[PDB]
Design a protein around this ligand. Structure first.
Ligand code: HEM
Ligand SMILES: COc1cccc(CO)c1O
Length: 403
């Protein structure tokens, strides 16, 4: 429809998944709010537009089409008003900074040590599968009450939910181009139900300190629980992004540091720089790259585009974090970049609820990794490939060290 952007008609889903940064570099210059045909949606690509849409009183949350097919209702990311307020009040207690600080060290540090002991003397490792993902899912899984769900299974679940929730491609008529791509999401949800329904049955009668037990009971009249159908979509939301993203953030931060060997050495030598390294890592390759959206509630003009009411806008925060209006050479990882605001945790009333927790998980994991393997080096025989448009991270991270 927009004539000068006719080249967007030839952008493919595979291209965006393999590397979205060249298309989005053009979008940020040509059309900070642009309709991308293969995605079937307007997309916000700059920091100014993403922040404006995410915080505007004329927009509210909406789930992406593939997200809605994957999660249903009421996914915390896709609802508003009283339901959103209730779901926020449900999840926020265990994520409060004063609460996290009471137990985060005793949670994550023994988990990190357990996985490190399996390989720290091998001299080689694939850190995504052997360390980053397991620590991320084991830490959250224990907090949630899924202690008996193996980390291999949690990792499989977030991979399947990832592919289902980012199965966004549409055809010429706006219909999903790959309808078969939701089936493995449906299979994961069925497996999750078989595992979690007995745990809920038990928590209803015998509450404990697990987060899901508290989701059932907190704030409820005596003897009542939230219906499991009301909380399952937020359980699924956790089993995708809350499980996946801290592992993604760790791994991207390591890849970035390896790209700047002088900076990797600084951080190993001075672990107090790890939080700064992670913040730059999240900006440099945002784990949640383009997974959420908002919808206009009235006619509104954004970046020169007059949008009717009811218009969805995808928030490509991963592109916003390479906005050259804010950052110098954003495609380069730079630990010594001035610490500026970033959008890797989103913005507004639907901004990430788990920032403080996530930052500590990533911090502790990297502290223990560098303590156990100070001479870590990247395996330069194997290149690092990143994959993902909705969620983005390295598919593997082969490293070596002198034993
Ligand atoms: C590095 C790790 C993480 C990153 C980069 C990240 C980023 C994000 C982003 C970009 C959003 C969408 C915000 C928006 O639409 O404006 C989000 C939402 C959310 N995140 Fe995080 N997240 C991470 C980890 C976690 C963890 C570990 C948890 C839970 C323990 C969590 C809980 C949530 C919740 C509940 C929401 C939905 C908020 C709402 O819609 O009201 N996140 N996150
Ligand atoms: C915390 O988990 C999520 C955050 C934002 C988006 C999704 C899925 O679209 C998530 O699962």
């Amino acid at each position: 429809e927009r004539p000068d952007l006719a080249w967007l008609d030839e952008v493919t889903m595979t291209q965006l998944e393999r590397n979205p940064y060249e298309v989005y570099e053009r979008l940020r210059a040509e059309a900070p709010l642009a309709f991308v045909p293969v995605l079937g949606s307007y997309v916000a690509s700059t920091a100014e537009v993403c922040r404006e849409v995410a915080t505007s009183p004329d927009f509210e949350a909406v789930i992406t089409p593939a997200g809605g097919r994957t999660f249903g209702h009421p996914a915390i990311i896709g609802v508003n008003g009283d339901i959103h307020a209730d779901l926020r009040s449900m999840v926020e207690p265990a994520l409060q900074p004063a609460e996290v600080d009471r137990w985060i060290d005793d949670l994550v540090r023994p988990i990190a040590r357990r996985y490190l002991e399996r390989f720290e003397n091998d001299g080689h490792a694939e850190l995504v599968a052997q360390y980053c993902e397991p620590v991320s899912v084991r830490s959250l899984g224990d907090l949630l009450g899924l202690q008996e769900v193996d980390s291999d299974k949690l990792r499989e679940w977030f991979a399947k939910l990832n592919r289902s929730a980012t199965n966004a491609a549409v055809d010429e008529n706006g219909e999903f181009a790959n309808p078969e791509g939701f089936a493995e999401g449906d299979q994961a949800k069925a497996e999750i139900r078989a595992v979690v329904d007995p745990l809920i049955d038990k928590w209803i009668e015998h509450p404990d300190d697990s987060a899901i037990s508290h989701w059932l009971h907190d704030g409820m009249p005596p003897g009542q629980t939230r219906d499991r159908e009301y909380i399952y979509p937020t359980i699924y939301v956790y089993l995708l992004g809350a499980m996946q993203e801290p592992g993604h953030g760790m791994a991207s931060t390591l890849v970035g540091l390896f790209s700047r060997p002088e900076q990797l050495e600084e951080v190993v030598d001075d672990p107090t720089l790890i939080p700064r390294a992670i913040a730059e890592g999240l900006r440099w390759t945002s784990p949640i790259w383009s997974a959420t959206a908002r919808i206009s509630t009235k006619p509104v003009t954004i970046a020169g585009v007059d949008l009717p009411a009811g218009t969805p806008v995808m928030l490509s925060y991963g592109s916003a974090n390479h906005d050259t209006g804010k950052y110098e050479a954003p495609s380069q990882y730079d630990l010594h970049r001035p610490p500026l605001p970033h959008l890797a945790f989103g913005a507004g009333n639907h901004a990430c609820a788990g920032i403080y927790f996530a930052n500590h998980v990533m911090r502790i994991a990297l502290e223990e990794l560098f303590e156990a393997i100070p001479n870590l080096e990247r395996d330069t025989r194997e290149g690092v490939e990143f994959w993902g448009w909705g969620f983005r991270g390295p598919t593997s991270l082969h490293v070596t060290w002198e034993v």
